[PDB]
A paper describes a structure:
BoNTs are synthesized as a single polypeptide chain (150 kDa), which is post-translationally cleaved into a di-chain molecule composed of light chain (LC, 50 kDa) and heavy chain (HC, 100 kDa). LC is the catalytic domain and a zinc-endopeptidase, while HC is further divided into two sub-domains of equal molecular mass called the translocation domain (Hn) and the membrane binding domain (Hc). Inhibition of neurotransmission takes place by proteolysis of one of the SNARE proteins that mediate cell secretion. Synaptobrevin (or VAMP) was identified as the BoNT/D specific substrate and is cleaved at the Lys59-Leu60 position.
The crystal of LHn/D diffracted at 2.3 Å resolution in space group P6422 with cell dimensions a = b = 173, c = 222 Å; α = β = 90, γ = 120°. Despite the large unit cell, a single molecule was present in the asymmetric unit corresponding to an unusually high solvent content of 75%. The X-ray crystal structure presents the two domains, LC and Hn, in a close interaction. No electron density was observed for regions 442–457 (between the two domains), residues 494–510, and the C-terminal poly-histidine tag (last fifteen residues), all in solvent-accessible areas. Additionally, one of the most intriguing features of BoNT, the ‘belt’ region (residues 458–547), which is part of Hn and surrounds LC, was visible in the electron density map (despite high solvent content in the crystal) in the structure presented here and highlights the intricate interactions between the two domains. A PISA22 analysis shows that the LC-belt interaction is supported by over 40 potential hydrogen bonds and 2 salt bridges, making up a 3373 Å2 contact area. Loss of the zinc ion was confirmed with a local rearrangement of the active site residues. Mutation of the zinc-coordinating H233 to tyrosine caused displacement of the catalytic ion, replaced in its position with the Y233 hydroxyl group. Overall, the role of the zinc ion appears mostly catalytic with little impact on the structural integrity of the light chain.
Numbering used by the authors: 1 to 441, 458 to 493, 511 to 871
C-alpha cells in the first residue's frame, strides 16, 4: 500500500542505480547533466533552478513578466548545502504525503502510471521506446566530455524553482511533443518546479468558520498540500487527461469598473483545486473531456491487441513487459477472445478518482489543515519557513505542534501567532498596480493588483448553448506490492532534443481615471503614516488625505470620543468609552423599507467606502433600496445574456420510421438546454459576480482594521502622556482591551459576511435568472413552431393521422422549468449557500 521513501545526502556519490547525472533538455538555464536522486520508484528529485525562457536569468527583471506576485533570488539553490536542504525538504514532504491514504493512493498512481511508449504518430502496431516524452538520458563524465551510458523511464522529475520563486503554474507548461500525448491518453513524463519553503497565504475574512476567540487571520499553506497539488498536474499529465491550456478563463478589464489585471486560469487549475469552483466549467464541457479521454483509452486498448514490432527494432523481446505495464495502468479487462478491452464502470471510476478525489480541497480536509476556501480568495504577502526543523514542522502534524502552543483551536499556520514563519517585505515582492486618479483624461493612489476582484470575461466560459444546431435521428449526449528496483535501462540511441524556449513579455501598470473620491480613496484616507506622531480622527475625507496626522473615520460619534483624550479622569474610563462606542456602532443593522429580498442592511458601508458617492449626500440606505442589490457593484454593467442557439431539422428525411426519433430527441434536447443554460448562469455568477460582492467583505474588513489601528495608536499616545496613580497597575488591562478589538472587528464581519452573502444570492435570482428565463422562453417558442412545421411538412408521409398524436407533444411546451436548487445538479451550490447562511 505504501511506497517507501529513501533518505539521501547531496554528498552521496553517484552509484549507477538511484543517484545519477541526468540530461534535461527542457531546462534552458542549465545545459549540462545534473545530479538526481530517486526518492521512490520513478520519482526523481533534482536540486537545481529551472527556466524554459530563451536567455534565462535568475535576476529581478526591470518590469514584471507575468500577472503573478513575484520574488527573485539568484543565490537560492546555488550551493551544495542549499541543495542538500532542498533534497531533504522534499523527502520529508513525501513522508508526510504517506501519512494519509489519499496521498498513498496518489503516489501509487504516479509510480505505476508511466507514459505510453508511443503517441498518435506512432503506427498502431508498434511500441516506440525512443521518445523524450518517456526517456531521460543518463550521462557520465569520461575523458573531458559528457557521455550517454543509459536511459531511465521516470514518471515525475522534481526541480527547484523558476526565476520567480513564487511561481505556481510552470508545471503545466508543456513544450514541443509533450503537449499532445498529455491530452490523448498516452501521457508524458512530468517535470515539476517547486520551492517548498516559500509559502503562499490566504485568509478567513469571508468565512463564517473563522475563530470566534482569535478573530480573522492570515494563514500560510501547508507545504505538503502545495506539493500534492503540483503532483496532481503530474497525475493528469501521466494518465493523458490533461486539459489543454486553450481551455481557460480570461480576465475582463474595462473602463468604468474596477477588476484585477489577472492571469488566465486554465481549466486544469480549476479541476486540480476542486470543490464548487469546478462548476465554473459547465457540465457540457466536462462531459466532452470525459468522452474524449474514453475514446483515447479505447484506442490504447486496441493498440495493445495489435502490437507486432518495436522501435528500436531490437526491443521485440520487451513487448510483453510493456503490454503488462500499460494494461495494468489503464486497468483494462480481457474479453473472452484474449483481447484487452475498456470496462466502462472501471474507466468512469478511475476518471472521477483522478479528477474529483485528487484535488486540493479534498486533500486539505484529509490532512486536517487550514486552506483557501474558494479559488479566487485573496492572496497576501507570502512567508518563508525552514521546514526541515522539527521544532517548526513535522511529518505527523505539520505546523500544529502541541508542545509549541499549536492545535486545532490555535493553528500553527497563523502568521501572526507563529513567530517561526518569516514574512516577506513588499519591497522584495514585485507585483502590478492599478493607479487611480481624480477627474480628467489631490494626488493619485496606487492599488496593488491582489486587492482587486477577479472578473472573468463572459466569452471565456462556454459558447455551446449559443450555437445554432441541427437535430437528427442520431443526436444525443487488487493492489500490487511496492517493490524498489534498479531503474537503469539500456541506452536507445535517442536523437538530441533542442527546444526553442519561450519569449519573455513585459507588463505595465494600469491607469484609471475616476469622477469622484471612491472606495480606494476612502480606504487610503483611513491609513496611518509610517512613524506616527500625534493623530486625530476626522470626519472629512479630503482632510485625512491632506495631512498625515489626520485619519478619516466613518463614525462621527467616535471622532469626538477619541480626540478628547484623558481629561483628568481615569485612563480606562476614556478607553472603555471609545471601545464601547466603536463596538456598539459597528454592530448596527437597519431593517429596510420596500419589499427587498434581503432581510437587513449594514448602514455604515456607505460612509466607510463611499459606495455610489453616497457619503456627504448621506443617503446609502435609500439609494440601496432604490437601485437594489446591484448598487454594490459600482460601474458594473447590467447583466445580459445573448440569444440561445436555435434548433432546426433536415429538409427531406422522408424515408424511414426514424423520422419519429428526431422528434423525441428534439424534446429531450430542449430539456438539456434549460439545464445547460442554468449551469452557464451559475458559472457567470461564480466567476464574475460572487467575486465582486466578496470584494466588499475585504474592503469592509480593511476599514474596520484601519479604525481599530487608529484607536490603538491613540490609546498608545494617551498612555505615554498619562500620569495617574494607577498607570502601572492598569497596564495589562489596557493591552488586553486593545487586543479585544480583533474580536470586535470579527463579530462585525459576521453581519457584513451575511449581508453580502444575501445580496450575492439575490443578484443570481433577481438580476440574472429572469434574463435567462426570458431567453429560454424565446427558445421554447421558436423550437415548438419548428416542430409544428416538421410534422406539417411530413404530412403525407409516415403519419396515417399519427399527426394528431404529435399535437400533445406540444402541450409539453405549456410548462416553463424555473430554476430549482433542491435538485441533484444544484447540490454543491446548495451546500455552499446553506453553510454561510447557517
Amino acid at each position: 500500500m505504501t511506497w517507501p521513501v529513501k533518505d539521501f545526502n547531496y554528498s552521496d556519490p553517484v552509484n549507477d542505480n538511484d543517484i545519477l547525472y541526468l540530461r534535461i533538455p527542457q531546462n534552458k538555464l542549465i545545459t549540462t547533466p545534473v545530479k538526481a536522486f530517486m526518492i521512490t520508484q520513478n520519482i526523481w528529485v533534482i536540486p537545481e533552478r529551472f527556466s524554459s525562457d530563451t536567455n534565462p536569468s535568475l535576476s529581478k527583471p526591470p518590469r514584471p513578466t507575468s500577472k503573478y506576485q513575484s520574488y527573485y533570488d539568484p543565490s537560492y539553490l546555488s550551493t551544495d548545502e542549499q541543495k542538500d536542504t532542498f533534497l531533504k525538504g522534499i523527502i520529508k514532504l513525501f513522508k508526510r504525503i504517506n501519512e494519509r491514504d489519499i496521498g498513498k493512493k496518489l503516489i501509487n498512481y504516479l509510480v505505476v502510471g508511466s507514459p505510453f511508449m508511443g503517441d498518435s504518430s506512432t503506427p498502431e502496431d508498434t511500441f516506440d521506446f525512443t521518445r523524450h516524452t518517456t526517456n531521460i538520458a543518463v550521462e557520465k563524465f569520461e575523458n573531458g566530455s559528457w557521455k550517454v551510458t543509459n536511459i531511465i523511464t521516470p514518471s515525475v522529475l522534481i526541480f527547484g524553482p523558476l526565476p520567480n520563486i513564487l511561481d505556481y503554474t510552470a508545471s503545466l507548461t508543456l513544450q514541443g511533443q509533450q503537449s499532445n500525448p498529455s491530452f490523448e491518453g498516452f501521457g508524458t513524463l512530468s517535470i515539476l518546479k517547486v520551492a517548498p519553503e516559500f509559502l503562499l497565504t490566504f485568509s478567513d475574512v469571508t468565512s463564517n468558520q473563522s475563530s470566534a476567540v482569535l478573530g480573522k487571520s492570515i494563514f500560510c499553506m501547508d507545504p505538503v498540500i502545495a506539493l500534492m497539488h503540483q503532483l496532481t498536474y503530474s497525475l493528469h499529465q501521466l494518465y493523458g487527461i490533461n486539459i489543454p491550456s486553450d481551455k481557460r478563463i480570461r480576465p475582463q478589464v474595462s473602463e468604468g469598473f474596477f477588476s484585477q489585471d489577472g492571469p488566465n486560469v486554465q481549466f486544469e487549475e480549476l479541476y486540480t483545486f476542486g470543490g464548487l469552483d469546478v462548476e465554473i466549467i459547465p457540465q457540457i464541457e466536462r462531459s466532452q473531456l470525459r468522452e474524449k479521454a474514453l475514446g483515447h483509452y479505447k484506442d490504447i486498448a486496441k493498440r495493445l491487441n495489435n502490437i507486432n514490432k518495436t522501435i528500436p527494432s531490437s526491443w521485440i523481446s520487451n513487448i510483453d513487459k510493456y503490454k503488462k505495464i500499460f494494461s495494468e495502468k489503464y486497468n483494462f479487462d480481457k474479453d473472452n477472445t484474449g483481447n484487452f478491452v475498456v470496462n466502462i464502470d472501471k474507466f468512469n471510476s478511475l476518471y472521477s478518482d483522478l479528477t474529483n478525489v485528487m484535488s486540493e480541497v479534498v486533500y486539505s480536509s484529509q490532512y486536517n489543515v487550514k486552506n483557501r476556501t474558494h479559488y479566487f480568495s485573496r492572496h497576501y504577502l507570502p512567508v518563508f519557513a525552514n521546514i526541515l526543523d522539527d521544532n517548526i514542522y513535522t511529518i505527523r502534524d505539520g505546523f500544529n505542534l502541541t508542545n509549541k502552543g499549536f492545535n486545532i483551536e490555535n493553528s500553527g499556520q497563523n502568521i501572526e501567532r507563529n513567530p517561526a514563519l518569516q514574512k516577506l517585505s513588499s519591497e522584495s515582492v514585485v507585483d502590478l498596480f492599478t493607479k487611480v486618479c481624480v477627474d480628467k483624461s489631490l494626488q493619485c493612489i496606487k492599488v496593488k493588483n491582489n486587492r482587486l476582484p477577479y472578473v472573468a470575461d463572459k466569452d471565456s466560459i462556454s459558447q455551446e448553448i449559443f450555437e445554432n444546431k441541427i437535430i437528427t435521428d442520431e443526436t444525443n449526449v487488487v493492489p500490487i506490492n511496492p517493490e524498489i528496483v534498479d531503474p537503469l535501462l539500456p541506452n536507445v540511441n535517442m536523437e538530441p532534443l533542442n527546444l526553442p524556449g519561450e519569449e519573455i513579455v513585459f507588463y505595465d501598470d494600469i491607469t484609471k481615471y475616476v469622477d469622484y473620491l471612491n472606495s480606494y480613496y476612502y480606504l487610503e484616507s483611513q491609513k496611518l503614516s509610517n512613524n506616527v506622531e500625534n493623530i486625530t480622527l476626522t470626519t472629512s475625507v479630503e482632510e485625512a488625505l491632506g495631512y498625515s496626522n489626520k485619519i478619516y473615520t466613518f463614525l462621527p460619534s467616535l471622532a469626538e470620543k477619541v480626540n478628547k483624550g484623558v481629561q483628568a479622569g481615569l485612563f480606562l474610563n476614556w478607553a472603555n468609552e471609545v471601545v464601547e462606542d466603536f463596538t456598539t456602532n459597528i454592530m448596527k443593522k437597519d431593517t429596510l423599507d420596500k419589499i427587498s429580498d434581503v432581510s437587513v442592511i449594514i448602514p455604515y458601508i456607505g460612509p466607510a467606502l463611499n459606495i455610489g458617492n453616497s457619503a456627504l449626500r448621506g443617503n446609502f440606505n435609500q439609494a440601496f433600496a432604490t437601485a437594489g442589490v446591484a448598487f454594490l457593484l459600482e460601474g458594473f454593467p447590467e447583466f445580459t445574456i445573448p440569444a440561445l442557439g436555435v434548433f432546426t431539422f433536415y429538409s427531406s428525411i422522408q424515408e424511414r420510421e426514424k423520422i419519429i426519433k428526431t422528434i423525441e430527441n428534439c424534446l429531450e434536447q430542449r430539456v438539456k438546454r434549460w439545464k445547460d443554460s442554468y449551469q452557464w448562469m451559475v458559472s457567470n455568477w461564480l466567476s464574475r459576480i460572487t467575486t465582486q460582492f466578496n470584494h466588499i467583505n475585504y474592503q469592509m474588513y480593511d476599514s474596520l482594521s484601519y479604525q481599530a489601528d487608529a484607536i490603538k495608536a491613540k490609546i498608545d499616545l494617551e498612555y505615554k502622556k498619562y500620569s495617574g496613580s494607577d498607570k502601572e497597575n492598569i497596564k495589562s488591562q489596557v493591552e488586553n482591551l486593545k487586543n479585544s478589538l480583533d474580536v470586535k472587528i470579527s463579530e462585525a464581519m459576521n453581519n457584513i459576511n451575511k449581508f453580502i452573502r444575501e445580496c450575492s444570492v439575490t443578484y443570481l435570482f433577481k438580476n440574472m435568472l429572469p434574463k435567462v428565463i426570458d431567453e429560454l422562453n424565446k427558445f421554447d417558442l421558436r423550437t415548438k413552431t419548428e416542430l409544428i412545421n416538421l410534422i406539417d411538412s411530413h404530412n403525407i408521409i409516415l403519419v396515417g393521422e399519427v399527426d394528431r398524436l404529435k399535437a400533445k407533444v406540444n402541450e409539453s411546451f405549456e410548462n416553463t422549468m424555473p430554476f430549482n436548487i433542491f435538485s441533484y445538479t444544484n447540490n454543491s451550490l446548495l451546500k455552499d449557500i446553506i453553510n454561510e447562511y447557517f
